[PDB]
Amino acid sequence: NTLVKQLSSKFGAISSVLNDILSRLDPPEAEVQIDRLITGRLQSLQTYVT
Amino acid sequence: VVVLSFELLHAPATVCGPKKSTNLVKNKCVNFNFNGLTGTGVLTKSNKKFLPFQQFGRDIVDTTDAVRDPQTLEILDITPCSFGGVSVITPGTNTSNQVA
Amino acid sequence: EKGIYQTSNFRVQPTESIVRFPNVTNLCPFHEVFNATRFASVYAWNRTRISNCVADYSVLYNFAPFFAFKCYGVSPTKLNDLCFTNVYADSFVIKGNEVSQIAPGQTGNIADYNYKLPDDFTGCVIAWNSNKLDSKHSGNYDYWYRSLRK
Amino acid sequence: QIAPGQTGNIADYNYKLPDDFTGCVIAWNSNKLDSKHSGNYDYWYRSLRKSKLKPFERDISTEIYQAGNKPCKGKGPNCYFPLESYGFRPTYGVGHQPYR
Amino acid sequence: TTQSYTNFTRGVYYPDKVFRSSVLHLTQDLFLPFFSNVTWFAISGTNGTKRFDNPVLPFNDGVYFASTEKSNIIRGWIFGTTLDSKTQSLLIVNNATNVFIKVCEFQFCNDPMESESGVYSSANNCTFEYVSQPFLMKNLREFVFKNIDGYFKIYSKHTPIIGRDFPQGFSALEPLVDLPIGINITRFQTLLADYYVGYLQPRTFLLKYNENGTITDAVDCALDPLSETKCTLKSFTV
Amino acid sequence: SKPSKRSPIEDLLFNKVTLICAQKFNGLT
Ligand SMILES: *[C@@H]1O[C@H](CO)[C@@H](O[C@@H]2O[C@H](CO)[C@@H](O)[C@H](O)[C@H]2NC(C)=O)[C@H](O)[C@H]1NC(C)=O
Ligand SMILES: *[C@@H]1O[C@H](CO)[C@@H](O)[C@H](O)[C@H]1NC(C)=O
Ligand SMILES: *[C@@H]1O[C@H](CO)[C@@H](O)[C@H](O)[C@H]1NC(C)=O
Ligand SMILES: *[C@@H]1O[C@H](CO)[C@@H](O)[C@H](O)[C@H]1NC(C)=O
Ligand SMILES: *[C@@H]1O[C@H](CO)[C@@H](O)[C@H](O)[C@H]1NC(C)=O
């Protein structure tokens, strides 16, 4: 339940939804925002597995 | 002559862009965009009763599971499209190359 | 080796993209500006504000053949994404040798003494021949323009 | 607009750099060579195009593009030719000056 | 005159337009805190029923307003930055046929047994107009008036009661209208022709949703150690 | 007599503790 809930977090990103990041911003800023979300989701998976 | 001057203001409106809709297809895996809400899923007739005010539904988690159709006002459930892992059952390549 | 291995993931792909947005339910009143019994003089433009509405831009191309249809801030094909805030429609009758002066970067007595547009301009200027409606054999002396200004 | 990830009339239809770009962009301002009162050969811009340009794609073909609801040819004020080249006089400012 | 502050557990509204079924949702939004001091103004409060004076109260990040008026003495609400006719202001007036919401540079006309006169009969530089069925048409007539990022949001509920001004039960307000007004809305004057005013503050609430998407209860997470426990556990039973 | 030949105690234990992927179907199975 927590791991799915983590999908709604922003982790410093503009939004939790990848499609909104891609639709609102230019490619390289969108890539920065996506890396912010990737770091957050990957950390959430590492926490879950540990 | 008609001159159309577009004023650039901070006000919240910015409203005139037309929106082109498509037909509604149910019981199939489709991509969708409902009033800016986007995703992938299977749209089916819902038994949920939204208040006239409510437009979207969510789970105990924030996953969206229902929408109000902006033209018909029908409530539709969103079922994720089928997904799951794949396992390969192999007798071993020193016995047979047949797998399940 | 003999055993069961997890190698990938099955996913069923979508076959269609469904875009449902509300009944459009409005037309920004652009047609009523182009289609009018009388237009304003050039010295005093008649400004109509269009705001808080959804704009169908196909009504502009379908109104009449045009003398000039030039959009400067937004490409003529990119007008459909939005009209931020509100738009002003200035409706007037001008001469053919004066229409060419109403644009960013232009000079001349009509732009300078009757009505100027900014050089950094977001908008579109649309012109069409009205000889059928405004001209008379007795002579149309109802329209005025300024030739001399301080 | 001569930079990775940018949009605009150049990045969209005339010259585009890839988002993953290695290199240097050098802009040399030399008005004494490229600015004449009668106009300058070296300018060209794409007006309308069916789609956005890909990185390093060089589109050197032209045909009339209609922005309206009917076919036409050559009717500049009604429909537009891909070339909308503009000149430059020494009297215009820094934002309009030619850059090599 | 103006009456002693009262203690209410009202002012809960649906924070968004999302349907939830049999869940407890913990949300951070601007709500009237439970048992906060709500000012009770007793027709016209301090002023008499024939006096043209008005509190012209300041509005701090949105308010809770309520009034039970069988005779419809209160006709509207005006919100604005200065309320001096020098800038834009939002005039909301219910004429018992339609409700008119206008943004204009309104001039103040000294608006008000049951005497009536023209109200905001003179204005210029109008920028916005909206018309809908009346907001109000013995009902408590609860409203929340909030102004966020240029959008002026009005929520309401209309429930009858005769014996007491406030029913003992719980109900949430539903959105009524959400307009792209853009006005700063620093302050507001009530238009009469007996009401309660409370103020919203940032608070976290645990909202209990029914099988259908209606809110049936709520916990103010900063009211009491027990309420705080309920919120941290996300349960109405501890 | 039961659909699953569990003891009365086992049946109690299974009743006391509480292909549609109804929960958390966001890449998790
Ligand atoms: C939720 O809304 C429904 C419809 O408005 C309410 O009505 C009941 O719906 C169920 C559906 O199976 C029927 O079996 C009942 O007979 C309906 N009751 C009545 C009086 O019509 C339902 O009661 C609402 N739920 C709650 C908890 O209030
Ligand atoms: C949209 O129009 C159709 C008829 O074409 C009508 O049946 C439907 O209810 C309308 N929806 C709205 C939201 O107005
Ligand atoms: C709280 O409200 C009740 C009525 O619901 C009232 O009897 C009580 O005195 C109030 N308490 C305070 C401190 O105002
Ligand atoms: C509220 O009104 C005052 C009037 O002087 C104004 O200065 C202030 O900016 C307004 N509030 C906001 C958020 O702008
Ligand atoms: C698969 O679907 C059929 C109906 O299409 C259903 O009867 C069957 O029970 C399903 N499989 C399982 C394991 O339930």
Side-chain angles (χ1 to χ4, degrees), chain A, chain B, chain C residues 1-83 85-150, chain D, chain E, chain F:
Chain A
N1 194 71
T2 300
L3 185 61
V4 173
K5 180 67 176 176
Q6 289 292 104
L7 291 170
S8 295
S9 293
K10 296 181 184 182
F11 312 103
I14 175 181
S15 168
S16 66
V17 179
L18 291 170
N19 287 335
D20 290 339
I21 291 167
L22 292 170
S23 293
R24 292 175 184 178
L25 295 174
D26 55 280
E29 189 65 20
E31 289 215 335
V32 171
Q33 293 293 312
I34 293 168
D35 277 11
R36 292 273 281 301
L37 292 179
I38 290 169
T39 297
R41 275 88 178 273
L42 179 54
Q43 184 177 12
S44 296
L45 288 170
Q46 295 295 100
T47 300
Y48 172 79
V49 171
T50 300
Chain B
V1 179
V2 179
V3 177
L4 305 178
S5 174
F6 289 62
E7 192 179 22
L8 309 179
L9 303 174
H10 58 288
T14 63
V15 297
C16 85
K19 306 293 182 182
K20 293 179 179 179
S21 66
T22 69
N23 199 358
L24 176 64
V25 304
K26 295 183 282 77
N27 304 318
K28 296 186 181 181
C29 180
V30 300
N31 292 83
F32 59 83
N33 184 323
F34 289 87
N35 300 326
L37 177 72
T38 165
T40 303
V42 179
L43 305 175
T44 66
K45 185 176 138 149
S46 179
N47 88 15
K48 293 178 180 180
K49 344 288 190 177
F50 283 25
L51 298 174
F53 301 85
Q54 293 168 324
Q55 304 301 121
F56 309 109
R58 294 179 191 272
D59 288 18
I60 303 207
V61 297
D62 294 323
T63 67
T64 302
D65 52 357
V67 296
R68 183 186 298 276
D69 183 8
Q71 299 179 12
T72 64
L73 308 185
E74 163 166 22
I75 305 118
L76 305 174
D77 286 277
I78 301 168
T79 299
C81 295
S82 296
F83 83 77
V86 54
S87 298
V88 181
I89 299 165
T90 166
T93 57
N94 215 239
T95 299
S96 177
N97 293 334
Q98 185 180 98
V99 299
Chain C
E1 263 85 53
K2 184 175 76 175
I4 183 165
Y5 301 90
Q6 296 72 31
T7 62
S8 85
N9 292 280
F10 285 114
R11 283 168 149 125
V12 177
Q13 300 302 27
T15 61
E16 336 197 346
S17 177
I18 305 302
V19 180
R20 295 276 282 184
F21 265 96
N23 271 5
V24 185
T25 59
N26 200 72
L27 295 42
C28 269
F30 284 94
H31 177 76
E32 292 78 4
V33 175
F34 279 72
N35 187 358
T37 301
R38 294 290 185 273
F39 276 50
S41 67
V42 180
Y43 183 61
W45 289 8
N46 183 17
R47 171 164 283 195
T48 297
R49 178 162 57 207
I50 297 175
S51 69
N52 296 316
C53 60
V54 57
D56 289 345
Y57 286 84
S58 71
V59 305
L60 297 173
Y61 286 133
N62 296 330
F63 174 75
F66 293 100
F67 182 66
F69 194 124
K70 173 68 182 177
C71 301
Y72 301 92
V74 179
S75 297
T77 63
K78 293 184 176 182
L79 296 174
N80 279 305
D81 289 345
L82 79 159
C83 302
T85 78
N86 46 6
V87 183
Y88 300 93
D90 292 348
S91 172
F92 58 95
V93 176
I94 186 164
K95 291 178 181 184
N97 290 331
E98 295 177 330
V99 171
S100 66
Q101 296 173 45
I102 299 174
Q106 307 304 302
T107 65
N109 289 344
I110 206 71
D112 294 331
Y113 303 150
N114 293 262
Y115 196 111
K116 179 172 172 71
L117 301 180
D119 299 311
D120 185 350
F121 175 71
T122 300
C124 189
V125 178
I126 302 167
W128 65 100
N129 189 286
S130 61
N131 190 54
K132 183 175 179 180
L133 301 176
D134 295 307
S135 297
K136 298 287 182 288
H137 286 293
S138 63
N140 182 331
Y141 294 97
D142 296 302
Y143 293 107
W144 291 79
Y145 68 103
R146 185 161 192 162
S147 297
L148 170 65
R149 190 171 187 270
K150 290 177 180 178
Chain D
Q1 293 177 47
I2 308 302
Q6 303 304 300
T7 65
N9 59 306
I10 303 304
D12 294 356
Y13 306 129
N14 300 339
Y15 179 84
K16 185 171 183 70
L17 298 180
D19 295 341
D20 185 353
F21 176 75
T22 298
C24 299
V25 178
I26 302 168
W28 184 34
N29 188 353
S30 185
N31 287 283
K32 71 183 183 181
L33 302 177
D34 297 325
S35 298
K36 278 93 172 190
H37 293 80
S38 65
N40 306 288
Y41 177 83
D42 295 348
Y43 288 113
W44 184 92
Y45 314 96
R46 179 62 57 91
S47 65
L48 305 177
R49 189 174 190 265
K50 290 180 180 179
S51 67
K52 292 181 179 178
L53 194 71
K54 293 182 179 179
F56 301 119
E57 180 184 2
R58 190 172 72 170
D59 182 341
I60 58 169
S61 296
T62 62
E63 180 56 294
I64 192 77
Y65 185 105
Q66 303 83 3
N69 294 322
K70 299 289 183 183
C72 52
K73 298 182 182 179
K75 295 185 179 182
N78 201 276
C79 54
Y80 295 83
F81 186 73
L83 182 151
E84 61 173 357
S85 178
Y86 301 107
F88 175 87
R89 295 190 166 166
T91 64
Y92 285 93
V94 172
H96 298 284
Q97 287 172 17
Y99 292 76
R100 291 176 169 205
Chain E
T1 59
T2 300
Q3 305 299 306
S4 298
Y5 299 102
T6 62
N7 53 324
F8 301 120
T9 86
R10 291 180 176 272
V12 175
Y13 62 89
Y14 293 86
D16 62 19
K17 297 181 78 82
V18 177
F19 172 88
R20 297 180 177 83
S21 175
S22 298
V23 303
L24 306 180
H25 182 70
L26 184 67
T27 172
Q28 178 184 153
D29 208 40
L30 304 179
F31 298 99
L32 184 66
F34 286 176
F35 298 94
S36 65
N37 59 320
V38 177
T39 303
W40 174 22
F41 297 92
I43 297 168
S44 299
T46 298
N47 298 314
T49 60
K50 296 183 179 180
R51 188 78 181 179
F52 288 82
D53 288 341
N54 191 302
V56 194
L57 300 174
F59 282 7
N60 302 85
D61 299 334
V63 310
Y64 171 77
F65 172 101
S67 65
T68 301
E69 292 186 338
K70 291 177 184 176
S71 63
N72 300 318
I73 293 167
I74 296 169
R75 303 294 174 84
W77 301 269
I78 59 199
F79 304 83
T81 301
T82 61
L83 300 175
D84 60 1
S85 86
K86 295 178 181 176
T87 189
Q88 298 296 329
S89 64
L90 176 65
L91 182 277
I92 305 178
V93 177
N94 184 347
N95 69 356
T97 301
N98 291 109
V99 59
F100 297 84
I101 302 176
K102 296 181 181 180
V103 178
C104 310
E105 297 179 356
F106 288 100
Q107 296 179 357
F108 289 75
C109 299
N110 196 26
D111 48 281
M113 293 315 285
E114 297 182 348
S115 177
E116 296 183 351
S117 68
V119 177
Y120 296 109
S121 66
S122 177
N124 208 329
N125 196 26
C126 209
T127 64
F128 179 93
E129 183 175 13
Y130 176 77
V131 182
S132 70
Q133 67 272 25
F135 284 181
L136 309 180
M137 316 65 83
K138 68 181 178 182
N139 294 324
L140 180 57
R141 255 172 279 308
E142 297 186 54
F143 291 82
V144 172
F145 299 133
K146 182 167 77 168
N147 189 44
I148 298 173
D149 298 330
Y151 286 89
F152 193 85
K153 297 174 185 284
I154 293 109
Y155 305 82
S156 68
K157 190 80 181 182
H158 304 299
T159 60
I161 187 166
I162 302 300
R164 295 100 179 179
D165 287 345
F166 298 86
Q168 297 86 330
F170 175 87
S171 67
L173 308 182
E174 297 178 10
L176 180 61
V177 61
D178 185 344
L179 306 175
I181 297 303
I183 298 178
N184 288 358
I185 294 169
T186 304
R187 175 210 203 182
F188 162 98
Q189 178 178 335
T190 304
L191 308 176
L192 283 74
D194 188 340
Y195 64 95
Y196 311 77
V197 179
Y199 291 79
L200 304 178
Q201 297 113 2
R203 293 290 186 93
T204 300
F205 279 61
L206 181 67
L207 304 176
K208 181 175 181 180
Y209 287 87
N210 210 337
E211 283 140 80
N212 304 304
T214 183
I215 298 166
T216 64
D217 205 342
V219 179
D220 180 339
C221 301
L223 182 61
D224 276 331
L226 180 58
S227 294
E228 189 179 71
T229 301
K230 287 177 179 177
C231 290
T232 205
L233 298 175
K234 298 182 182 177
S235 177
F236 280 64
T237 42
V238 180
Chain F
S1 70
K2 294 182 185 284
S4 178
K5 309 153 280 311
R6 298 191 300 206
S7 71
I9 291 168
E10 288 172 327
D11 193 56
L12 176 61
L13 291 168
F14 276 84
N15 288 333
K16 192 141 287 286
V17 179
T18 59
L19 301 180
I20 299 169
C21 298
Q23 297 292 309
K24 286 82 179 179
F25 194 57
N26 293 96
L28 313 176
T29 185

